[PDB]
Amino acid sequence: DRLSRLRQMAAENQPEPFMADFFNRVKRIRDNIEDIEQAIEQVAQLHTESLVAVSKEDRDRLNEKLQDTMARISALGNKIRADLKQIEKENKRAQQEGTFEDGTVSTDLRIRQSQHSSLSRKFVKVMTRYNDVQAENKRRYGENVARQCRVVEPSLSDDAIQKVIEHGNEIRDRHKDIQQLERSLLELHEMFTDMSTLVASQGEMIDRIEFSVEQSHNYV
Amino acid sequence: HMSLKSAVKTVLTNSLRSVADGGDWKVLVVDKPALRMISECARMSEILDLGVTVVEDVSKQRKVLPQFHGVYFIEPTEENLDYVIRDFADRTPTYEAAHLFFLSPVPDALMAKLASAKAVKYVKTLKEINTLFIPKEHRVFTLNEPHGLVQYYGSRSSSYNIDHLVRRLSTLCTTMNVAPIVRYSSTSTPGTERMAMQLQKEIDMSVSQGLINAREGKLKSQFLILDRAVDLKSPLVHELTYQAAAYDLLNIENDIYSYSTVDAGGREQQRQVVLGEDDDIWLQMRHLHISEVFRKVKSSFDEFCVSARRLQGLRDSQQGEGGAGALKQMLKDLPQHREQMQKYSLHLDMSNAINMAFSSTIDSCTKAEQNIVTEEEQDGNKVRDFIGEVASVVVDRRVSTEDKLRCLMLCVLAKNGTSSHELNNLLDNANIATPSRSAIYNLEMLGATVVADRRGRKPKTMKRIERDMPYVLSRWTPIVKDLMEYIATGQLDLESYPAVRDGPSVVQPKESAKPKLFVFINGTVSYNEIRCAYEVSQSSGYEVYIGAHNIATPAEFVELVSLLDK
Structure with missing residues (x-):
């Protein structure tokens, strides 16, 4: 509407890339994160599907997808982590240069910092969904599969919890399946660890718009 | 829309997704009034994945970025247009193009100034958003005028300009998409009565203009306009609900609270956080009595830890230094939950601080x-x-x-x-x-x-x-609560609080639904009156929204009143 009226009232009178590699990494990170998001919700089914399901007929068929998607989610994870770290070092080794006193920064470094912060959060939150479905399944991958597989010993409450916990036909493979979820939880833990301390001396306030636009520059 | 923050974010989103660019990042060029409004409805993270990569102040504009389209949220004011015609004017343009969204209608004299300058060729899209009110809380709107009380009742009150005030407020009705009956006190100041009259014609000139379309159910949306004099006591009283007590007794400048906790190692790490809608403990806890908050945050914190360990495979047999050792063990064992932890440590702290200040x-x-x-x-x-x-x-x-x-x-x-x-x-x-x-x-x-x-x-x-x-x-x-409930029951005399129009439309027997009730008090609004809009929404009948030129704590209200003659 008001655009037409302007172009009518105005006719009655008559580049360089810019941080190309960087916007690449964050596209990559966004894309990987979305990939992981879809992958996670598929590992979800593949797990609850390995409940019963005609024994080893399909068990091997599923455990083939699981440790395949699992390895991808991991490979995608490590790239995201390396792209993030790379940007951190990139930013850190640019502070002193990208500040011209006045307290102000530089649109380059400002953008880098808001991208770096936002995505690290997006990342920890996605992986937390993963961490949750792994432990969620590992708890019942021992309850309604390993323990309830006491159709061999009449052992009641304690002799099935005091025994199954330590060792852990088809009850032999579920062990290999539990310790998978365990080095999964471990990778994640390791990751969450240096991801948490990685927000230290960063942000606390960066997610606030007002804060970013206060440290803007000027003077051409 | 239910929440004013949702409503304002929707206009921003609907506008950003109307920008017809080539699909690269966008630059959000913003005003001081625009900055405030947008900052209160969206985090940076929510702006990033809306396809804007930076936010800039319309003033200054360094760093030329021709690869990106500039989007301006900005006021129909000469000072601004000069910044726009300036970002282009020169040899190399500052963005691939300009997408100009004006906060309210743009005058013709200014429209011309833009048409004559070079910038005209670059301006793709140009709309009038009709939103210039700060969405402070889901149910609280604000005008970002911290001296409103003075400008309006002070010794210069004669020249206040109730025009820009009426339009700011009618803004509330377009973005909320509702066409309310205006109510005012029989004993309103003349300045106020007139404001209420004019507000009615404004929303109406918007409705016969298709800027708002409603169904008009049996019950009607009303917009109550009040002088500060409606209740001079509420602004002053020590109050023991969480939000209200915090802002009174503690040092909360611009919604920022400071406390001290520990991380992996380094102790007395001084955190500054903003109190706001994206903190789930803040919500739910903020209208509760402080004695009860003290202990629910503690409960909620302990339940969270116990639960978050059972989601993995562990158990809390280790208790050193009480809940601090829980916080240390959680940040070590479940780093994933670092942010929930910061959230609890903030309210453990603030809760305690209030309890101590209530000597x-x-x-x-x-x-x-x-x-x-x-x-x-x-x-x-x-x-x-x-x-x-x-x-x-x-x-x-x-x-x-x-x-x-x-x-x-x-x-x-x-x-x-x-x-x-x-x-x-x-x-x-x-x-x-x-x-x-x-x-x-x-x-x-x-x-x-x-x-x-x-x-x-x-x-x-x-x-x-x-x-x-x-x-x-x-x-x-607070008296304002009684005003709310009476209206949510058509039980508020027309002689005591007359309507501009359709007076008999609020007769009395001797989620996304429900009618809205906006209450606007000139000058100042109190946290206890704010609490009331929430209490009255969750109780009977209407959805209530409350606002004023600004929020003032009891200290700030004392300062304002002392300034009325200076």
Whole structure:
């Protein structure tokens, strides 16, 4: 509407890339994160599907997808982590240069910092969904599969919890399946660890718009 | 829309997704008024994945970025257009193009100035968003005018400009998409009556213009317009609900609170966080009594830890240094939860800080304040010597000047007429420095009558609903709540609060649904009145929204009133 009226009232009178590699990494990170998001919700089914399901007929068929998607989610994870770290070092080794006193920064470094912060959060939150479905399944991958597989010993409450916990036909493979979820939880833990301390001396306030636009520059 | 923050974010989103660019990042060029409004409805993270990569201040504009489209949220003001025609004018343009969204309608004289300058070729899209009100909370709107009270009732009130005020407020109705009946007090100031008249024509000139379309159910959306004088007590009273007590007793500048915790190692790490809608403990806890908050945050924290370990495979047999050792063990064992942890540590802290600040002294002030303001004791024994109530507080030398002022102000509001002599002596006995006394006398400018020789103002004729008030330091209910509930029941006299139009449309028998009730008070709004809009939404009938030129704590309201003559 008001655009037409302007172009009518105005006719009655008559580049360089810019941080190309960087916007690449964050596209990559966004894309990987979305990939992981879809992958996670598929590992979800593949797990609850390995409940019963005609024994080893399909068990091997599923455990083939699981440790395949699992390895991808991991490979995608490590790239995201390396792209993030790379940007951190990139930013850190640019502070002193990208500040011209006045307290102000530089649109380059400002953008880098808001991208770096936002995505690290997006990342920890996605992986937390993963961490949750792994432990969620590992708890019942021992309850309604390993323990309830006491159709061999009449052992009641304690002799099935005091025994199954330590060792852990088809009850032999579920062990290999539990310790998978365990080095999964471990990778994640390791990751969450240096991801948490990685927000230290960063942000606390960066997610606030007002804060970013206060440290803007000027003077051409 | 339910929430004003949702509503404002929707306009931003709908506008950003209308920008017809080539699919690269966008640059959001923003005003001071735009900055404030957008900052309150969206985090940076939410702006990033909306396809903007930076936010910039329309002033300054360094770093030229021709690869990206510039989007401007900005006011129809010469100063701004000069920044726009300037970002292009020169040889190399500053963005691939400009997408101009104006906060309210743009005058023709300015439209021309843009058409003649080079910039014209670059401007793709140009709309009028019709939103210039700060969405402070889901149910609270604000005008970002911290001196509103002064500009409006002060000794320059004559030249206030109620035009820009009416349009700002009508903005509330377009972005909310509702066409309300305007209500005002029979005893409104002339300045206010006129504002209410004009607001009715504004929303109506918007409805016959298709800027808002509604169905108009049996019950009607109303927009209540109030002078600060509706209730001069609520702004002053010590209040024991969480939000209200925090902002009073603690140091909360621009919504930022500071505390101290520990990380992996380094202790006394001073965090500054903003109090806001994206903190789930803040919500849910903010309208609760502080004694109850103290212990639910602790409960919620302990339940969270116990649960978050059972989601993995562990168990809490280790308890060192109480809950601090839980916080250490959680940040070590479940790094994933670092942010929930920061959230609990903030409210553990703030909760505790409030409890500590509510000293026996403050309790004394509160007891006195409640007695004066409800005019009876816990007992029910009517209180008649208002000056006697205050004596206890005013001798007490442990009591802040500001606290004494608050009690004194409440006292002259109750007395409704006190001799020049008895008042000058009360102020002398209280050791209140003469410059600080304008907090008392300036109540005249809000229609109070403080000195007996100025002649008393005819008693406010409105029944109080009467409620069950359990807590003995929380017996006062803001008048505005009674206004809300009466309206949510068509039970509010038309003689007491007339409508601009369709008066008989609020007759009385002797989620996304429900009608809206907007309440706007000139000058200042109080956290206890804010709480009321929430209480009354979740209780009966309407959805309530409350606002003012700004939010003022009791300290800030004392400062404002003292400034009315300066």
